[PDB]
Write a protein that binds this ligand. Structure first.
Ligand SMILES: CCCCCCCC/C=C\CCCCCCCC(=O)O[C@H](COC(=O)CCCCCCCCCCCCCCC)COP(=O)([O-])OCC[N+](C)(C)C
Ligand SMILES: CC(C)C(=O)OC[C@H]1O[C@@H](n2ccc(NO)nc2=O)[C@H](O)[C@@H]1O
Ligand SMILES: CC(C)C(=O)OC[C@H]1O[C@@H](n2ccc(NO)nc2=O)[C@H](O)[C@@H]1O
Ligand SMILES: CC(C)C(=O)OC[C@H]1O[C@@H](n2ccc(NO)nc2=O)[C@H](O)[C@@H]1O
Lengths: 521, 533, 533
């Protein structure tokens, strides 16, 4: 094999140039594919052209910023110095302008809609105050994230509710995510037989976790996910104090489940601070997944309201995490692709078992609590006593503060009780039943039991229920997070209940703002 | 800012008094609620009133006993001194009186009942004698634990089986255990859908283990379980005279599985002697766990007999271990060290729940895989036996036919009559080679056949057996001693104390036989007390 | 006490005689049973008489070989010496005669069979040359194991395929294995209910794995599989001349999986050379286990071809390993040490069964989860490919429409005709990227389509392929070489021998390619001997 050795030496002589040539050949082939697709039919080939243009623009921008960083920094430094010099009096001007804008908005927009929106605004203020009062570290609170989150959720709500173009983009993104999950559905269909839909959770919801684990492992190996995390971290750090990890988690949870989303930042989980872990859990508890979203738009719940609530939850989750548990402490392996995929698979084999077992145990305990309450009520002539009715009676003032008129406070409180102590699936079933009763028509009160509730109360209830804040969710979150990062086990269980409460309050805040904006048609 | 800090400091200054007052106010409010419930309608509120009275009495009793232990010991000392002084001649009188009482009770009661009761008593004597003969150190035997264990079993059986209020009380306790464990379906149905019943075993029976493990972890963290364990262990320690560590483990094994029982004394596990380790393994084998009790009651097995079997099996295991592998060396664990139990790592409730749930994972996985393998082996064995027996004009030959003749003498000695001893032998064989779940399934089928009625002999094959034989079989099957389950238990124990690995395997096989003999002793006593239909 | 010790000592003195008497009595009883069965009805007792006769013959043969090995070696030595003396000129004559015989066979048989068989032989030559070229050490290649492996494969294929009694024997064995695993399929109904057929894969295919693992551990404890492995390994070692460890491993994979086969030489894994480690990996990747044999035969795959491929894969595996990665260092493992296989440490048979059952859990879990992930990725890939192809007015583009063209040359060289090479190419692609289960499923569907009948071409798409192509595809797919399994093998083997980790990851992909080439060689040899329908 003298010839083989000579050829190997020759290739090694021009190894870099050979690699550059082959990569250039592949790039030329991809560009030829794009150009041919455009030639045959441009409208048909438009998405591939747009994707290619965005990718090439990002590559060029990154290279240019890396090369010309010195000149850009030197040019920008004087502006930063000037801003630092004049901040002392400029902060007052900015705050005054913002207060003036809020006053104008209340005067011209909300006052015209009706009196019920001012109550929504009052509720918003009350909720913020209460969250600050019971915060873990009241003194060490950073108010910039909170105000930015409230303002951002307000703007996004106004961008999705008032304008159709804003609606279209988020609809498109949701469709893409659901289409993505359909693939794990197909794999599970093969492995568990065609009758896998008989056992929905066990044979459908967990294969999603397996597939997402696999893909995320591969994407961390390739290096795209770290680029995404860097870009998101930078933009969010300029716009808010939020750190990159929790910002990315919160953005991901908009369309991804609570159990899947922490896999976005799995490598960083051991080294996150307590506040960032609390923010991760809270962001998980205050959003719903994609498949459930499809099933809820199927039941008859409005699609626009579900989408608006899902999008608005993330800023609200971040603001409530930063207020409820501020950050006092200072922050802070795959040889090839097949290794990435296989390691993802194995991590999944651990995760799924832990999740399932914890969920079983927690639901059993909750049912026992409810049955002991029913027994105690039976001894008092009121066997109907349970968690749901205690919430139907306790939650009425909060429901009224959210904006729903007094008459409909009871039904909204009961729905929130079902949602908190039973998955929001049953809560949305009840809500759709009430919507159907209203649409069919009939007497408002049969004898003394109300049948349905106004349209506006239905919208508020739709906003309030959009979240995975239950105790089964508590179980699956604890199990999954302890499987992902065993080192932080003692820390994960510490902030679980506060995370759950923060998630529920985030849902209530989104509902408060939505009621501030929406009006009965 | 500063005001909040000042308020926090002021609260901390009076933190103890304020917290005590608030907790007392909450307790008083609960008491007022109970009082109001009783006033409104006493009959409905009777359970809550009884629970409150019992809890108050036990709290007061524990507090007083802690307060005046020295005075109690001082008052007791003169009596102990006098008894020690006069024991030299009083021991013979006590022994003679005990022998006379035994003879009188045996003659009158048993001879009135029939011959099967006398046969069961003879079987008890035979089992004890055989255990004594095949003992590790027959010369170095200490008979006091043996006699006291047999006496405690007899007293428990006489108090439950022969007294109606006790029978009703234990039946009620079993019903409550079943009802409590039935709540696992709330989670099983959610996780596995409403069709979870379609796969009965996998999506009903296994989740019960998960729920029980979580509940026991929570109770161990809180400290309710340790209270009962300490009390029963103290009773056994004072009566029989066993060592504190083995007494605590045997008392715990009543309602805790064999795998999780030694975790109570894990910190001191390396320092146990050989005899104590053998007793630990035996007490683990002889008794069943609390999780399986609900499932077995569901099949139709009597709850009173299950509960009585567990309670009587604890002292059975201890006495048989002391007779079978007597201790020949000085123990190294103090009573205070043994009794004290400290949570491994549970700062808050959620951590305890999560830890129990996580352990149930491996438990259930091993259980299911072993079941699959061993039932496949059973089917193959039956087919091969039938094929071999077809050669000799006997195609009915199977595993059951061999087992019925093999184990017949044990069933006959336990007190079962001649004709029914073969079916009990079949059950014993199923339990010995395969875990007791399948044996209990077969027993439930026989019980259902009896209850439904019909011909006792269809053509020439008996369909069901008497009620007394069913009670005896219930007692003789209440254990975890299996050939298949040996390996796992060894591994589990070896995980807790690797330093003792060489010792654990040495006494692993003999503990299984000791546990089976203990089960047979409990069954012998039950057969003696029960009366023929 | 003293009498008991004296009796124990006396029994210890005669312990060996007691064991010998017990074994003699058992043997006499078995012989008496066989005699009774034969005399009652020789027709019914034929199978048991045959089993007894073969068992006695093998026992006698083993005893004679063990006792008189020295005399046999003494007698054989002069002949070997004379052969070595004349070898200098005899080797040319033997080689020329062998080549002449090969040419005569080709001309007389293969040309008459048709052109496709000549193409199959050409493909055999092409595969051998291609493997030689891209070899780790082309200059240092030992050519004896290559020619001897090809010769043994040809001899075995000729014997089984071209002789009817041999063809019937392997069919009979396949049916017996079907029945043996059907026992497990029945035994899983208890755990997963009577509706386990609803979820075919998870609740039928995996219990087969568990039961096979249990049976394998049982047999390993007894010592039969070790006997068979020793005999086959000796047959291959006397001919080829490979090393002891690699011969034993490649001779014990015919029925053992890849993950568990190295346990045979687990103690010596850290001392194996790089070449022998590669041979172990290759023999792992080029054979299937016996657990999956039943399922594949049930789908409709021919049993004779499955068993013939399993048997032929081992010589091909070794020949390809020795061609691809020839040995350049002296092994340090003795033949006596390698052939020795330590029996299971299990105290009894049932402990071994439990150990195997507990071991199977990780294998089943990894299989399931890898299947889920990889099929999800396949669905995503197909969707993206169709989306891209829609832009060029070709939405039919997909993963299989690329595999058909990518792997076509390999199928064509194997001897398949032009028209049917694309379907075999799709099957090869499915087996390479995803496990052979899915490829065999597609093959079963095509065989069912052929058997049912109907139009050969319903449209411009072919429906089913010829019979000979089905046999060739049966041979080519009989392996465990997957991208998905490339990880698990490494993970297990590093667990067995951590010190060798750096070496294991070096020779994994080459081992996988060697396994695939071994499968293709078996397919070529099979296709050269199969006449067109
Ligand atoms: C849409 C949402 C409105 C977001 C503004 C909310 C007020 C934040 C005030 C604050 O403390 O941050 C300050 C000014 O924040 C700004 O950078 C200017 C914000 C006004 C421009 C909005 C268009 C900066 O916070 P700091 O550097 O920590 O001091
Ligand atoms: C029970 C099924 C049918 C259901 O949909 O009820 C909603 C509840 O099921 C959990 N859940 C659901 C979907 C998901 N990703 O798509 N992750 C989850 O955790 C979550 O607890 C929620 O409350
Ligand atoms: C499916 C279950 C109910 C069953 O059939 O049980 C048979 C085997 O399960 C072991 N087991 C069970 C429960 C437990 N704690 O609740 N500890 C144990 O060890 C025990 O060894 C026995 O042999
Ligand atoms: C569903 C099962 C039966 C199956 O089709 O298996 C596919 C993959 O599972 C690996 N496997 C399988 C069996 C075994 N011993 O019986 N050892 C293994 O490693 C092996 O990689 C193969 O590709």
């Amino acid at each position: 094999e003298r010839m083989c050795g000579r050829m190997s030496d020759f290739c090694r002589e021009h190894k870099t140039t050979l690699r550059y040539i082959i990569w250039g050949i592949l790039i030329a082939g991809y560009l030829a594919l794009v150009i041919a697709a455009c030639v045959m039919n441009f409208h048909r080939a438009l998405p591939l052209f747009v994707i290619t243009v965005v990718a090439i623009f990002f590559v060029v921008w990154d290279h240019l910023m890396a090369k010309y960083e010195s000149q850009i920094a030197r040019f920008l430094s004087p502006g930063q110095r000037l801003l630092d010099s004049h901040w002392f009096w400029l902060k007052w001007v900015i705050w005054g302008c913002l207060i003036l804008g809020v006053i104008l908005w209340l005067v011209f927009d909300t006052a015209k809609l009706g009196q019920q929106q001012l109550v929504s605004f009052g509720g918003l203020i009350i909720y913020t105050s209460l969250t600050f009062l019971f915060s873990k570290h009241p003194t060490k609170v950073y108010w910039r994230p909170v105000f930015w989150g409230i303002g951002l959720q307000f703007l996004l709500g106004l961008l999705i509710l008032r304008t159709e173009p804003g609606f279209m983009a988020f609809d498109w993104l949701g469709k893409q995510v659901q289409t993505f999950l359909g693939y794990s559905d197909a794999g599970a269909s093969f492995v568990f037989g065609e009758k896998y839909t008989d056992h929905f959770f066990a044979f459908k919801v967990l294969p999603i976790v397996i597939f997402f684990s696999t893909v995320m492992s591969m994407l961390y190996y390739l290096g795209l996910m770290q680029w995404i995390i860097r870009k998101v971290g930078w933009v969010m750090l300029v716009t808010m104090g939020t750190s990159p990890v929790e910002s990315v988690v919160a953005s991901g949870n908009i369309f991804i489940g609570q159990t899947e989303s922490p896999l976005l930042v799995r490598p960083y989980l051991p080294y996150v601070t307590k506040s960032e872990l609390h923010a991760i859990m809270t962001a998980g508890f205050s959003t719903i997944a994609g498949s459930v979203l499809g099933a809820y738009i199927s039941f008859g719940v409005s699609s626009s309201h579900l989408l608006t609530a899902s999008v608005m939850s993330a800023p609200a989750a971040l603001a409530i995490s930063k207020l409820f548990w501020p950050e006092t402490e200072t922050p802070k392996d795959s040889r090839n692709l097949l290794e990435a995929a296989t390691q993802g698979a194995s991590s999944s084999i651990s995760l799924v078992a832990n999740i399932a077992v914890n969920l079983i145990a927690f639901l059993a305990l909750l049912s026992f609590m409810n049955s002991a309450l029913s027994w105690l009520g039976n001894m008092f002539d009121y066997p109907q006593l349970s968690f749901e009715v205690i919430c139907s009676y306790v939650f009425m003032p909060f429901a009224f503060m959210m904006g729903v008129d007094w008459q409909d406070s009871f039904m909204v409180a009961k729905l929130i009780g079902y949602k908190t102590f039973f998955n929001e699936f049953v809560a949305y079933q009840q809500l759709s039943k009430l919507i159907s009763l209203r649409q069919v028509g009939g007497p408002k009160f049969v004898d003394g039991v109300q049948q349905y509730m106004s349209m506006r109360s239905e919208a508020i209830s739709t906003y309030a229920l959009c979240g995975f804040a239950n105790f089964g969710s508590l179980g699956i979150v604890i199990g999954g997070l302890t499987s992902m990062a065993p080192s932080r086990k003692r820390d994960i269980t510490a902030g679980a209940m506060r995370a759950l409460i923060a998630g529920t309050i985030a849902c209530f805040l989104t509902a408060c703002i939505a009621g501030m904006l929406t009006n009965t048609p």
